Design a protein around this ligand. Structure first.
Ligand SMILES: *C/C=C(C)/C=C/C=C(C)/C=C/C1=C(C)CCCC1(C)C
Ligand SMILES: CCCCCCCCCCCCCCCCCCCC
Ligand SMILES: CCCCCCCCCCCCCCCCCCCC
Ligand SMILES: CCCCCCCCCCCCCCCCCCCC
Ligand SMILES: CCCCCCCCCCCCCCCCCCCC
Ligand SMILES: CCCCCCCCCCCCCCCCCCCC
Ligand SMILES: CCCCCCCCCCCCCCCCCCCC
Ligand SMILES: CCCCCCCCCCCCCCCCCCCC
Ligand SMILES: CCCCCCCCCCCCCCCCCCCC
Ligand SMILES: CCCCCCCCCCCCCCCCCCCC
Ligand SMILES: CCCCCCCCCCCCCCCCCCCC
Length: 265
């Protein structure tokens, strides 16, 4: 199956790699619940014309909280401690670790995170329906092809990389459309709004790039380097969680600050 189950079935997990990963995943869904409350409570602070962005942030928070909670429980209950060896190992009587929860979260959140900026900025020469359709098509294809490659993570590293490269083609199309959206959205808004939009672009670029980084993380030190271990598992889940908080919660806070800035007129 996946690299997490491979490690848990051969070398097992140290108590520190197991507990750290449980804690980081728990932090992940706890932040989404706090974000859910934040976006509900602050919807009164933006003009009606921008509130669809707060609404979409709140729906993403629900998606992420429920599915990261499921992923968290799946991590903790998939490995049991062997007192003889002193490590956690894959439990044959459990469900085994499954990354489907996170991939389903991506299929849901990606179309909504890309959609919601179109309710705060105005396009100029681009058409709303054209940008929306390009975001939704390439976002869904990016996740589908990525999910396929994920099946070959352990069994066929070459198919793993080929599918992930196909997925990356769709990712670069998204980055290209988003850059055009940001550029058109900067036209004829205030300098303070243009500065926030520049920050949104940098946040978007870095936080979304973290996801392919975490996808590749165990092979980034080679076919048997330092990361091809429980340390690549800790690092992959830490980088996912950082990307999750950044791409969903911080991105949404910044769009709300932009909406407030744009009401000053
Ligand atoms: C909150 C969830 C978000 C923002 C998910 C974003 C996911 C991606 C940008 C995934 C990208 C991938 C690649 C570009 C190549 C390798 C496979 C993926 C699916 C991890
Ligand atoms: C707008 C007001 C911002 C305050 C939000 C503080 C969040 C605290 C997180 C949990 C501590
Ligand atoms: C610009 C207004 C100030 C931003 C406040 C952001 C608050 C986001 C709430 C989610 C963060 C919760 C962190 C602690 C959870 C554990
Ligand atoms: C309007 C007050 C801001 C609410 C912050 C969101 C609650 C965070 C809970 C942790
Ligand atoms: C539309 C936002 C709600 C999406 C929820 C997705 C289903 C959650 C499933 C959790 C357990 C599997
Ligand atoms: C088209 C595929 C997009 C992601 C689907 C992943 C569904 C996995 C659901 C979790 C399974 C729990 C067992
Ligand atoms: C406006 C949001 C439209 C997309 C939400 C659901 C994403 C795909 C679910 C399958
Ligand atoms: C300049 C306003 C702050 C933009 C970045 C804020 C997020 C940094 C990580 C927390
Ligand atoms: C588009 C894919 C980005 C992957 C970033 C990983 C960088 C690895 C550096 C070693
Ligand atoms: C805006 C978020 C910035 C995150 C920078 C990347 C974090 C590096 C963690 C690497 C751990 C190995
Ligand atoms: C004007 C721009 C101000 C943007 C503020 C961004 C900071 C948001 C803080 C939320 C971070 C929550 C993460 C807590 C995890 C521990």
């Amino acid at each position: 199956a996946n690299f997490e189950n491979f490690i848990g079935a051969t070398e097992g997990f140290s108590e520190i790699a197991y507990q750290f990963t449980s804690h980081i995943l728990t932090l992940g869904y706890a932040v989404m619940l706090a974000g859910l409350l934040y976006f509900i409570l602050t919807i009164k602070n933006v003009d009606k014309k921008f509130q669809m962005s707060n609404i979409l942030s709140a729906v993403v928070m629900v998606s992420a909280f429920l599915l990261l909670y499921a992923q968290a429980q799946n991590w903790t209950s998939s490995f049991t401690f062997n007192e003889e060896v002193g490590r956690y190992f894959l439990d044959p009587s459990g469900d085994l670790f499954n990354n489907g929860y996170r991939y389903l979260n991506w299929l849901i959140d990606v179309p909504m995170l890309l959609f919601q900026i179109l309710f705060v900025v105005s396009l100029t020469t681009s058409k709303f329906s054209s940008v929306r359709n390009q975001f939704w098509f390439s976002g869904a294809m990016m996740i589908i092809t990525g999910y396929i490659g994920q099946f070959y993570e352990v069994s066929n590293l070459t198919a793993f990389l080929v599918w992930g490269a196909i997925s990356s083609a769709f990712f670069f199309h998204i980055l290209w459309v988003m850059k055009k959206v940001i550029n058109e959205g900067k036209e004829g808004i205030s300098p303070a709004g243009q500065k926030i939009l520049s920050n949104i672009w940098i946040l978007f670029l870095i936080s979304w790039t973290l996801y392919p980084g975490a996808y590749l993380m165990p092979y980034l030190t080679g076919v048997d380097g330092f990361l091809y271990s429980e340390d690549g598992v800790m690092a992959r889940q830490l980088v996912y969680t950082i990307a999750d908080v950044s791409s969903k919660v911080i991105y949404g806070v910044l769009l709300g600050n932009l909406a407030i800035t744009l009401s000053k007129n």
